[PDB]
Amino acid sequence: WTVPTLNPDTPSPIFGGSTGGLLRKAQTEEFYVITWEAKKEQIFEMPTGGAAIMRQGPNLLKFGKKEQCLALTTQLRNKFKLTPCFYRVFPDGKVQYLHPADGVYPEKVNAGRVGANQNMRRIGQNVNPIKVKFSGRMMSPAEI
Amino acid sequence: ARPTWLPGLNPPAHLKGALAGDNGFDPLGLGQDEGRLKWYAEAEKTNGRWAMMAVAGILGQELLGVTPAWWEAGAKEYDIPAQALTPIEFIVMGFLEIKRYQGFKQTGTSGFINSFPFDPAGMNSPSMATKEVKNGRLAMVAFIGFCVQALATRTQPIEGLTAHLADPFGKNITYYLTHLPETL
Amino acid sequence: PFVPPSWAPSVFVPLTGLVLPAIAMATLFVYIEKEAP
Amino acid sequence: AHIVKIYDTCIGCTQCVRACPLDVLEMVPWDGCKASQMASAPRTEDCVGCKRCETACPTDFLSVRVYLGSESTRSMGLSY
Amino acid sequence: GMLETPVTSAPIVATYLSNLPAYRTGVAPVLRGVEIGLAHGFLLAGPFIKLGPLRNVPETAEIAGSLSAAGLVLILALCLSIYGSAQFQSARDPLFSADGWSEFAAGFLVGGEAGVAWAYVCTQ
Numbered sequence A: 001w002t003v004p005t006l007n008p009d010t011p012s013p014i015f016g017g018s019t020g021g022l023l024r025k026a027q028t029e030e031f032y033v034i035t036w037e038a039k040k041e042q043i044f045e046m047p048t049g050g051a052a053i054m055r056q057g058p059n060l061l062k063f064g065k066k067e068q069c070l071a072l073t074t075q076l077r078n079k080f081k082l083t084p085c086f087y088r089v090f091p092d093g094k095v096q097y098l099h100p101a102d103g104v105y106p107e108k109v110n111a112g113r114v115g116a117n118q119n120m121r122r123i124g125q126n127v128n129p130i131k132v133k134f135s136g137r138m139m140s141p142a143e144i
Numbered sequence B: 001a002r003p004t005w006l007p008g009l010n011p012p013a014h015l016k017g018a019l020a021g022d023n024g025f026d027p028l029g030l031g032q033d034e035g036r037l038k039w040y041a042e043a044e045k046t047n048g049r050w051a052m053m054a055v056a057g058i059l060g061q062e063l064l065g066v067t068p069a070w071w072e073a074g075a076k077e078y079d080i081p082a083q084a085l086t087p088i089e090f091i092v093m094g095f096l097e098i099k100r101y102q103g104f105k106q107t108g109t110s111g112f113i114n115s116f117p118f119d120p121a122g123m124n125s126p127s128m129a130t131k132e133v134k135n136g137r138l139a140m141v142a143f144i145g146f147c148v149q150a151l152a153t154r155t156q157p158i159e160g161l162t163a164h165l166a167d168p169f170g171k172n173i174t175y176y177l178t179h180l181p182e183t184l
Numbered sequence C: 001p002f003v004p005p006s007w008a009p010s011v012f013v014p015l016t017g018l019v020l021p022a023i024a025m026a027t028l029f030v031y032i033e034k035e036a037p
Numbered sequence D: 001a002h003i004v005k006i007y008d009t010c011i012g013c014t015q016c017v018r019a020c021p022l023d024v025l026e027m028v029p030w031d032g033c034k035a036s037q038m039a040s041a042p043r044t045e046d047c048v049g050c051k052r053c054e055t056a057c058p059t060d061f062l063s064v065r066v067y068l069g070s071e072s073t074r075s076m077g078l079s080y
Numbered sequence E: 001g002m003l004e005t006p007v008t009s010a011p012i013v014a015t016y017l018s019n020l021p022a023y024r025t026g027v028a029p030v031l032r033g034v035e036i037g038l039a040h041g042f043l044l045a046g047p048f049i050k051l052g053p054l055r056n057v058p059e060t061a062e063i064a065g066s067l068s069a070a071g072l073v074l075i076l077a078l079c080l081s082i083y084g085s086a087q088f089q090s091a092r093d094p095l096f097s098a099d100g101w102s103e104f105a106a107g108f109l110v111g112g113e114a115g116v117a118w119a120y121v122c123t124q
């Protein structure tokens, strides 16, 4: 598995449009692009409101925040049994790929992943807040 | 080609056009010393700033109907006698000026008390610097007109303008200067 | 010696109720919006 | 950014990963439980603080904990 | 994309906006400030004169209302100035810059007060 490269010329579903789409943020900070393959033309529900028809073959959509992309991904996987993937696109033209980070959806365990933010203790074994006081910033006992 | 006070005049070396309101007008070469120029530049503003407030005050007092002449106001009597005005003014005015000098030495810019620069509204810009001096220079020249016109005419600024407006050719400097005893 | 002039409220009420608030709000609005170097 | 911590009482049910609506969590190999897998939080910069993961954790007390912290465009869930 | 609509996308509407001082590019920000200030300043005098506290006084109503319209223009000019200070601290049009907006605010004050004064002259 290798990191996919986004194709900006991918066709988009048949959608009239709505007022729930991108705002000025997309032009200044970032936006998100989700792409997938469709076996047949079908009607799905846009997370921004309304219904759109997915073309047979590749499809591409642009959303304002990550949660909107992953909300559509859940719908496509659960009902239509598709395998979408989405990116983060910056105004400068850079494209960042994510979900699936390594090509396998996170629900399935995969070798090569490195545990992060894992504490080898229980919640009840954290230190008291007094012992992490005056540490330069508000710090919870869980952080240390 | 930056405009100069005299057309066709090349600005002298010590005037580089950096300071706001620069026009190459240093015929006597007073600003040739960089150390003195920095002091003079700040000194120009403060003389102008006092002038601008003074010109507004003289006009404001006249227009609002303040009967005493702007030069006779000192003799007038107020609730607080002169026994207390001078001691308060010296103490209050000294503190503002003492701290003004201290800040200028450290930073080199104007300020107020502990604020150097004193720009609460963030209006400071290269354009505003030029607008400050040019209005300031105008006030300085205008104020002297108030003082000189007081001697020649013994009349308030607007009263003089209205007199000039009344008869344009009349009520000029020639009448007051030639007929000095009458106006006195 | 202490008694202020009879016209003091005419100047100080508008000054503290309309003028200083305007400068204070402008000072605070600029300050909060100011960006760090 | 919020803080998300996984504690050693995890049984590797994967319910926290499925629940997360921003793909913040993932499962990694482990030897401390029968399932031989543990939850991980590699992408906390995308966490919004919904705490759907905590709702889904079967262990008592929770094995995944979310501590709301500094706010940002991503953690505040803004599309503008 | 965005929901197309005649109000959002129509030829007649677009041309009208393109001729307004705000959208008319190629004009110095100061001049646009004067043009905008004059229009608002002239209108601002109306409501103060007719519905002010001194509206029923025969001759003082005109003076008091216009003098209050001049005051509001002064407050608005301050709002324009500080907005530029906060917004532009670091693009195609010169207006949306620290230098441009400062000129724009100055023009609004000059135009606005001129409009208020011009409105007064119309009455008397």
Ligand code: CLA
Residues within 6 Å of the ligand: B005, B015, B019, B020, B021, B022, B023, B024, B025, B026, B029, B030, B031, B032, B036, B037, B040, B041, B043, B044, B047, B048, B137, B138, B140, B141, B144
């Ligand atoms: C408080 C008064 C004052 C001061 C300190 C200055 C200082 C300065 N001016 Mg400014 N200026 C003033 C008033 C003043 N000006 C006024 C009133 C006008 C309008 C008439 C101007 C118009 C002006 C121009 C057009 C230019 C300057 C410039 C300068 C610089 C010249 C170099 C130097 O070292 O000068 C030092 C000067 C002094 C120490 C002055 C000492 C006192 C003098 C000798 C008294 C003269 C009295 C006069 C003959 C009689 C009154 C006349 C009046 C009624 C018209 C310097 C920063 C030049 C510059 O580049 O500025 C950045 C420049 O281009 N000035």
Ligand code: CLA
Residues within 6 Å of the ligand: C013, C014, C016, C017, C018, E052, E053, E054, E064, E065, E067, E068, E070, E071, E074
């Ligand atoms: C202490 C605070 C304060 C003060 C002093 C005032 C004062 C005033 N208010 Mg009130 N007001 C306030 C707070 C205040 N208000 C607040 C917080 C609110 C919101 C709840 C209101 C809402 C309000 C309304 C809705 C109205 C008033 C009005 C008035 C006026 C009533 C008296 C009259 O007949 O004026 C007559 C006024 C004049 C003859 C002109 C006075 C001077 C004008 C307003 C400004 C001149 C500026 C000058 C030309 C240039 C700048 C000078 C400056 C730099 C020194 C008077 C100017 C009435 C009014 O007429 O407003 C215009 C009015 O309709 N106020």
Ligand code: CLA
Residues within 6 Å of the ligand: E047, E048, E051, E052, E053, E054
């Ligand atoms: C919304 C409610 C409301 C309304 C309509 C009024 C109305 C009025 N009040 Mg009152 N007032 C209110 C609430 C209200 N008040 C409240 C809540 C308080 C308590 C804080 C007061 C306290 C108060 C005081 C103390 C005074 C008044 C006074 C007044 C009068 C003058 C106000 C004035 O000068 O406005 C100025 C108006 C404007 C600057 C413009 C108004 C808005 C314009 C018309 C919008 C136009 C939009 C346009 C149609 C858009 C076109 C778009 C197109 C071009 C595309 C007027 C009868 C004064 C008076 O004397 O009354 C008799 C007075 O002294 N009011």
Ligand SMILES: CCCCCCCCCCCCO[C@H]1O[C@H](CO)[C@@H](O[C@H]2O[C@H](CO)[C@@H](O)[C@H](O)[C@H]2O)[C@H](O)[C@H]1O
Residues within 6 Å of the ligand: B078, B079, C005, C006, C007
């Ligand atoms: C650096 C700062 C320098 C000083 C700046 C001073 C700015 C000007 C402040 C003026 C304040 C008002 O002051 C002015 O009020 C009244 C004007 O008719 C005068 O007051 C006098 O006359 C009034 C009108 O008949 C009466 O109601 C008063 O009882 C009487 O005391 C004051 O004697 C005068 O000084």
Ligand code: SF4
Residues within 6 Å of the ligand: D006, D009, D010, D011, D012, D013, D014, D015, D016, D017, D038, D039, D056, D057, D058, D059, D063, D064
């Ligand atoms: S944290 Fe809880 S829900 Fe997630 S894998 Fe561990 S036991 Fe299961």
Ligand code: SF4
Residues within 6 Å of the ligand: D004, D019, D020, D021, D022, D023, D024, D025, D046, D047, D048, D049, D050, D051, D052, D053, D054, D066
């Ligand atoms: S709080 Fe919400 S976004 Fe963060 S890890 Fe838990 S489920 Fe995911």
